[PDB]
Amino acid sequence: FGNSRADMEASGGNSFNGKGGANASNTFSGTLTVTVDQVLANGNLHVVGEKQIAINQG
Amino acid sequence: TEFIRFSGVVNPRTISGSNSVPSTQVADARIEYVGNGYINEAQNMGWLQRFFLNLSPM
């Protein structure tokens, strides 16, 4: 063990970090009167409707 | 001069006792609120700015 022939010193490290995410949303509020355009074979009603507004520019 | 125009289809059993219907019970509602005069002319975009708003790259 003379002349520092056995001394030793070492270090080491390692790291990792990952992450992620996502989201989505939507809302809707109002009232609209539609019209029946077809009566299906089991009594259900197919309905369609449209409302058009024009306030001063568009 | 301001113009308020309206067009639609009404179901008679929705008319109230005072001969009135809320506009949310009309089927093909077309409402329009426009005007003329220079007060209305002061709210259209200039032809150059209108051209740029559509054909500018960004």
Coordinates of C-alpha atoms in Angstrom, one line a residue:
Chain A
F1 CA 0.0 0.0 0.0
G2 CA 3.0 2.3 -0.3
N3 CA 3.3 5.3 -2.6
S4 CA -0.5 5.6 -2.7
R5 CA -0.6 2.6 -5.0
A6 CA -4.0 1.5 -3.5
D7 CA -5.8 4.8 -2.9
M8 CA -9.0 5.1 -4.8
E9 CA -11.9 7.6 -5.3
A10 CA -14.8 7.4 -7.7
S11 CA -18.2 9.0 -8.2
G12 CA -21.2 8.4 -10.5
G13 CA -24.6 9.8 -11.1
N14 CA -27.7 9.4 -13.3
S15 CA -31.1 11.1 -13.5
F16 CA -34.2 11.1 -15.6
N17 CA -37.6 12.9 -15.4
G18 CA -40.4 12.7 -18.0
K19 CA -44.0 13.8 -17.8
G20 CA -46.9 14.8 -20.0
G21 CA -50.6 15.5 -20.1
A22 CA -53.6 16.8 -22.1
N23 CA -57.1 18.0 -21.6
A24 CA -60.1 19.3 -23.5
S25 CA -63.5 20.9 -22.8
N26 CA -66.5 22.5 -24.3
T27 CA -69.8 24.2 -23.3
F28 CA -72.9 25.3 -25.1
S29 CA -76.1 27.1 -23.9
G30 CA -79.1 28.3 -25.7
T31 CA -82.6 27.6 -27.1
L32 CA -83.6 26.7 -30.6
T33 CA -86.9 25.5 -32.2
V34 CA -86.5 22.8 -34.8
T35 CA -88.8 20.9 -37.2
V36 CA -89.5 17.3 -37.7
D37 CA -88.5 16.2 -41.2
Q38 CA -89.0 12.4 -40.9
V39 CA -90.7 9.8 -38.7
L40 CA -88.6 6.7 -38.3
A41 CA -90.0 3.1 -38.2
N42 CA -90.1 2.9 -34.4
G43 CA -91.6 6.3 -33.7
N44 CA -88.4 8.3 -33.3
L45 CA -88.4 11.8 -35.0
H46 CA -85.5 13.2 -37.1
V47 CA -85.4 16.9 -36.5
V48 CA -83.5 19.7 -38.2
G49 CA -83.4 23.4 -37.5
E50 CA -81.6 26.7 -38.3
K51 CA -81.6 30.2 -36.8
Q52 CA -80.0 33.2 -38.6
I53 CA -79.2 36.4 -36.8
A54 CA -77.7 39.6 -38.3
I55 CA -76.8 42.3 -35.7
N56 CA -75.6 45.3 -37.6
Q57 CA -72.5 44.0 -39.4
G58 CA -72.5 40.3 -40.1
Chain B
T1 CA -82.5 54.9 -40.3
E2 CA -82.6 51.6 -38.5
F3 CA -84.4 48.5 -39.8
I4 CA -85.5 45.6 -37.6
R5 CA -86.8 42.7 -39.7
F6 CA -88.2 39.4 -38.6
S7 CA -89.4 36.2 -40.3
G8 CA -90.4 32.8 -39.0
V9 CA -93.0 30.1 -38.4
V10 CA -95.2 29.9 -35.3
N11 CA -97.3 27.2 -33.7
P12 CA -100.6 28.6 -32.6
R13 CA -100.8 26.7 -29.3
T14 CA -97.7 28.6 -28.1
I15 CA -99.3 32.1 -28.3
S16 CA -99.9 33.5 -24.8
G17 CA -103.2 35.0 -23.6
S18 CA -102.0 38.5 -24.5
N19 CA -101.3 37.6 -28.2
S20 CA -97.5 37.3 -27.7
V21 CA -94.8 34.7 -28.4
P22 CA -91.2 34.6 -27.2
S23 CA -88.8 34.5 -30.1
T24 CA -87.3 31.2 -28.9
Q25 CA -90.5 29.3 -29.9
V26 CA -90.3 30.4 -33.6
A27 CA -89.0 27.7 -35.9
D28 CA -87.2 29.3 -38.9
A29 CA -86.1 32.5 -37.1
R30 CA -84.6 35.1 -39.3
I31 CA -83.8 38.3 -37.3
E32 CA -82.1 41.4 -38.8
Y33 CA -81.1 44.7 -37.1
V34 CA -79.3 46.9 -39.6
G35 CA -79.0 50.7 -40.4
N36 CA -77.9 53.2 -42.9
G37 CA -76.6 56.8 -42.9
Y38 CA -73.0 57.8 -42.1
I39 CA -73.2 56.3 -38.7
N40 CA -73.4 52.9 -40.4
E41 CA -70.8 53.9 -42.9
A42 CA -68.4 54.6 -40.1
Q43 CA -68.5 50.9 -39.2
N44 CA -67.4 49.3 -42.4
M45 CA -63.8 48.5 -42.9
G46 CA -61.8 50.4 -45.6
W47 CA -61.4 48.5 -48.8
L48 CA -57.6 48.4 -48.4
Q49 CA -57.8 47.1 -44.8
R50 CA -60.4 44.6 -45.8
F51 CA -58.1 43.4 -48.6
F52 CA -55.2 43.1 -46.2
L53 CA -57.2 41.2 -43.6
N54 CA -57.8 38.5 -46.1
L55 CA -54.6 38.4 -48.2
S56 CA -51.9 39.3 -45.7
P57 CA -49.5 36.5 -44.9
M58 CA -50.0 37.0 -41.2

